Amino acid sequence: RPPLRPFSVVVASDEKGGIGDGGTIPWEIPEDMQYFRRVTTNLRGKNVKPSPSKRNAVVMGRKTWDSLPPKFRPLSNRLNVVLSRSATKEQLLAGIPDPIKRAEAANDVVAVNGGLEDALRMLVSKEHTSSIETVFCIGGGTIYKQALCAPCVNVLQAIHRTVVRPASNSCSVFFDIPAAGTKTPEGLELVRESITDERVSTGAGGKKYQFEKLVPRN
Ligand SMILES: NC(=O)C1=CN([C@@H]2O[C@H](COP(=O)(O)OP(=O)(O)OC[C@H]3O[C@@H](n4cnc5c(N)ncnc54)[C@H](OP(=O)(O)O)[C@@H]3O)[C@@H](O)[C@H]2O)C=CC1
Ligand SMILES: CC1(C)N=C(N)N=C(N)N1OCCCOc1cc(Cl)c(Cl)cc1Cl
């Protein structure tokens, strides 16, 4: 069976696993926004600037793409891989209000009529193996779930999770991660590799957050 491209998950969720209200993210944590940008944009080695020749790819569901404000659509300096059963590349670009930016964005957007697995099969192509350094799954609910299920979970390299507290009173969409010291029936157990001390966001509500990195146990 054609092998799947390895990948990492980047997500922000509260203790109840909440990640959103169905349409957007309920909290304002600029520190996470900035960290997310750096983590998904940065290329390894010294002074390697992202370009179509080599850059990371961010895989997201169509609803997550729609959730991106104009200033973040597409996510610059990264290949935007959008999963949709109906929306084509042109249709995804059609929603970008600035016509010149929309023209410039054509080079950074690819539509996949399939789920995460389909995206990973595609990112394994010799073209992408060279031009795409790291693949980051960035949501939302439907995509995160596929990430922790076979066969995708078998090539999951790490989870960069921003833990948010206190729990949101607006979350209806979740990301179910197995608790520490627990192994899912499917066979996945995560181990903390690192975690920052809790900090208070300068954002509205002053949410308390931590940047945690988890990896599958082997
Ligand atoms: N806290 C966090 O870190 C993050 C939170 N979010 C939030 O989560 C919510 C969105 O999550 P969610 O509702 O799950 O939507 P998703 O972002 O997961 O997108 C789901 C959509 O993607 C496409 N899709 C999913 N699986 C397949 C498949 N197998 N084949 C083809 N297309 C597929 C389909 O779009 P189509 O309808 O076009 O067919 C589907 O409706 C929002 O509240 C958002 O703000 C999003 C990212 C990160
Ligand atoms: C949650 C966020 C950023 N943080 C971490 N750690 N991990 C993620 N996967 N993230 O979401 C990526 C896709 C949605 O991005 C946005 C959504 C909104 Cl609503 C706005 Cl205003 C700006 C951006 Cl870039």
Three-class DSSP labels, the chain: CCCCCCEEEEEEEECCCEEECCCCCCCCCHHHHHHHHHHHHCCCCCCCCCECCEEEEEEEEHHHHHHCCHHHCCCCCCEEEEECCCCCHHHHHCCCCCHHHHHHHHHHEEEECCCHHHHHHHCCCHHHHHHEEEEEECCCHHHHHHHCCCCHHHHEEEEEEEEEECCCCCCCEECCCCCCCCCCCCCCCEEEEEECCCEECCCCCCCEEEEEEEEECC
CA-to-CA separations, 107 to 6, 121, 139, 167, 189, in angstroms, rounded: 23, 20, 21, 38, 38
Q: Is the CB of 115 under 6 A from ligand 1?
A: yes
Q: Greatest CA span in the chain, whole angstroms?
A: 51
Comparing CA positions, the residue from 61, 174, 181, 156 lying closest to residue 112 is 61
Comparing CA positions, the residue from 155, 164, 141, 171 lying closest to residue 218 is 155
Q: Is the CB of 211 under 6 A from ligand 2?
A: no
Instruction: Give the residue, out of 59, 92, 142, 159, with the most ligand 1 atoms within 8 A of its beta carbon, to mutate for a pocket test.
Output: 142
Q: How far is the CA of 2 from the centre of ligand 2 (A)?
A: 31
Q: How far is the CA of 1 from the centre of ligand 1 (A)?
A: 26
Taken in order of first residue, the domains within the chain and their CATH numbers are: 1-218 (3.40.430.10)
The experimental method, as deposited, was X-ray
Q: Give the up-direction half-sphere exposure of residue 88: CA atoms within 13 A in the CB hemisphere.
A: 2
Q: Give the rounded distance of the alpha carbon of 177 from its chain centre.
A: 15
Q: Is the CB of 10 under 6 A from ligand 2?
A: yes
